[PDB]
């Protein structure tokens, strides 16, 4: 009950010559891969740890001004001088004031005034960077057996965890009774951490763009500082007042924490307290099913009554899960399972939990199956006591075709050209489609970086109109397509 | 896909590290070092064009 009911679930079906399939794993999503003669497996990337960070810059979000002093010189006599202006801990500004016999020196006119204050930082946000070789992806592989999961949240016993790091290109996991699953992931073309800063402010962290983080208008330290006193642009965090050209004063702006929370609107929040472990992004992996085998194929079919302990439940993914219990003999046996029509003449549905088996009599078994749209009957057991459980799917093949088209379109909107890697059996059409997607997405990312979804909507509307009101039919079609894709991306962005 | 620059890398001594320079292709490529019994395969990505 890990990948069932997650609502971000993709069924990868089949393998290629070579017994490998291409799957992109996302943190909040799940992948269920099915191939004929092979156990169904669930995949989930559950953790991404970045180790050995290097602080790139330390920004000040809250300061205090102390040790304020001011200096002035009489008009025409040049700039005033402050010793504090020697030290870069003091933020200084120069201005003019009206001077005269009343103000206290010889002549009348605009005198020079310099006010300085010691800048001290009370709260800073630290931006950290990691090297791609230092990333580490935790992937859980749980055989979709139907055996009731052991006590816990699948962290132990059933469900094997594999750590995918760029040091080794082949990750191997032994699933007892199923053989070995080989994954060749690519943790180098995932997030692209060379362009990313790990920004943490106050028990909160974000995965932010590096240039964006370097363009932040706040006082900063180099990151190699170790002194934390020589901030660069302190003038962003102070304001000097000369309301009437009478005297100059410097006050300190308030805490920038809320303004920075607003600035982080589109960044994705991560965890940086107990290690730099984040839960956003994907991981393209090549799944090798060469040494994967169905478990319990040497067992005989169960000759005994099955009772449905938990009533058939429709899953979010057009599949049904039924929990059954065994009362017969021959403890470890194959559950006789089928989805047929009323007359029990045709097989209408595919069993997702392939090769269901009751290991022990006491333990129930969760079977997942995918019934067809409409009436179907789930047959369970041999004729004496055989269960015949009716089911109605409540859908259409056209409906699921449109729904899967929408899911693929959304995947392209999220994964860019990495969408073509999803469930790809090394095809040639997929290769050409991915190359075209790479070129088109490069152009699109150049043309639309740093614009908002409202801006994308406006641009898409404008381009669609330009295409519609075009004399050239080819240019018309091109512009209308570009505008429609841009409108789709604007509607489906900012999430 | 790529050619090595430290042509003919050889281990002169057992516990004596040897560092190879290669020129990998643009995009995805894999550096394979050793033979099958314990072969290590290293993913790399070259950013240019």
């Amino acid at each position, epitope marked *: 009950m890990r990948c069932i009911g997650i609502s971000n679930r993709d069924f990868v079906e089949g393998v290629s010559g070579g017994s490998w399939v291409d799957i992109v794993l996302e943190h909040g999503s799940c992948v269920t891969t099915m191939a004929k003669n092979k156990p169904t497996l669930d995949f989930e990337l559950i953790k991404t740890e970045a180790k050995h960070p290097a602080t790139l810059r330390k920004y000040c979000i809250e300061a205090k001004l102390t040790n304020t002093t001011t200096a002035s010189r009489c008009p025409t006599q040049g700039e005033p001088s402050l010793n504090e202006e020697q030290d870069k801990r003091f933020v200084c500004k120069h201005s003019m004031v009206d001077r005269g016999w009343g103000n206290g020196c010889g002549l009348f006119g605009k005198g020079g005034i310099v006010t300085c204050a010691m800048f001290t930082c009370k709260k800073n946000m630290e931006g950290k960077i990691v090297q791609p070789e230092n990333l580490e992806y935790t992937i859980v592989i749980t055989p979709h057996s139907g055996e009731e999961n052991a006590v816990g949240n699948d962290t132990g016993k059933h469900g094997k965890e594999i750590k995918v790091t760029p040091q080794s290109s082949i990750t191997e996991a032994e699933l007892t009774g199923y053989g070995t699953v080989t994954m060749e992931c690519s943790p180098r073309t995932g997030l692209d951490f060379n362009e990313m800063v790990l920004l943490q402010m106050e028990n909160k962290a974000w995965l932010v763009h590096r240039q964006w983080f370097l363009d932040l208008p706040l006082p900063w330290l180099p990151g190699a500082d*170790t002194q934390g006193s020589n901030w660069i642009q302190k003038e962003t965090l102070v304001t000097f007042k000369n309301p009437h050209a009478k005297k100059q004063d410097v006050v300190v702006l308030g805490s920038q924490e809320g303004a920075m929370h607003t600035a982080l609107t589109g960044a994705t929040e991560i965890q940086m307290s107990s290690g730099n472990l984040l839960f956003t992004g994907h991981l393209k992996c090549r799944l090798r099913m060469d040494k994967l085998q169905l478990k319990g194929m040497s067992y005989s079919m169960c000759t005994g009554k099955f009772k449905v302990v938990k009533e058939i439940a429709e899953t979010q993914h057009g599949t049904i899960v039924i929990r059954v219990q065994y009362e017969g003999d021959g403890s470890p046996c194959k559950i006789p399972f089928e989805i047929m029509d009323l007359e029990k003449r045709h097989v209408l549905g595919r069993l997702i939990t392939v090769n269901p088996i009751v290991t022990e009599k006491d333990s129930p078994v969760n079977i997942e199956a995918e019934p067809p749209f409409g009436d179907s009957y789930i047959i369970i057991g041999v004729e004496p006591g055989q269960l015949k459980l009716s089911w109605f799917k409540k859908g259409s093949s056209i409906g699921q075709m449109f729904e899967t088209t929408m899911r693929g379109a959304k995947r392209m909107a999220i994964l860019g050209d990495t969408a073509w890697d999803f469930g790809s059996l090394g095809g040639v059409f997929t290769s050409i489609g991915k190359a075209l997607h790479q070129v088109f997405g490069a152009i699109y990312g150049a043309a639309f970086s740093g614009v908002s979804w409202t801006m994308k909507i406006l641009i898409g509307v404008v381009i669609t109109w330009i295409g519609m009101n075009s004399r050239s039919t080819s240019l018309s079609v091109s512009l209308v397509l570009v505008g429609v894709v841009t409108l789709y991306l604007g509607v489906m962005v900012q999430a | 896909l790529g050619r090595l620059i430290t042509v003919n890398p050889i281990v002169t001594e057992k516990d004596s590290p040897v560092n190879i320079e290669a020129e990998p292709p643009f995009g995805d490529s894999y550096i394979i070092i050793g033979v099958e019994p314990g072969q290590l395969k290293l993913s790399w990505f070259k950013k240019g064009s």
Partner: antibody
Amino acid sequence: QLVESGAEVKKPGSSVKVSCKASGGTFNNYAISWVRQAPGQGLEWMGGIIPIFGGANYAQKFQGRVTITADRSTSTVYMELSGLRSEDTAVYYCARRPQSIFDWNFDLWGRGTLVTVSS
Amino acid sequence: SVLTQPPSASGTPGQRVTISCSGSSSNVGSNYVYWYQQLPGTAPKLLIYRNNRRPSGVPDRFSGSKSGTSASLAISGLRSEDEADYYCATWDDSLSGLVFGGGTKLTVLG
């Protein structure tokens, strides 16, 4: 040749700066590291620096507590300890190694400066 | 993980003694191992650098050994001069710093 500053007596919570002058060739072609040894204890690497380049590297134990600097005009390497305590009483050595990340042979050592917190 | 050595080592003059330096793959086995001979009240003297390499001007009685994850320093013939603390130093990739063996004193008899 690698000449170190004289022994210093300090007090808890204070700071001590240890100097280590070096010849021109060793200053611009090598790296200088700082290793302490508490009496009756093993050597402990604190950090080092490539004086030609600067930007010292520090051990995790001494992170935020030590600052290694090099004076190129005087060809001298400086070490400064902040928050001195009794457990920081030990002899401090400046040692010369090649300026490569893989080779850490200190073929030349200073005599060693002993910092004590008592009389 | 870090370098570990036997705190003390005994011997007799004209003997062969080997000191073991045990660490994790992060420090020993992924980097060179350096052996230092320190006399009482004297700066440590570089004894072995890289692996099983002797600096010019050192007697051949000293021999270092490098295993996949552990290292050793062997002495050809023993004397009263060999009685001194011996340290193994190796760069640690995870610790991002140089780690010393912790010390090993050779207690020659006689």
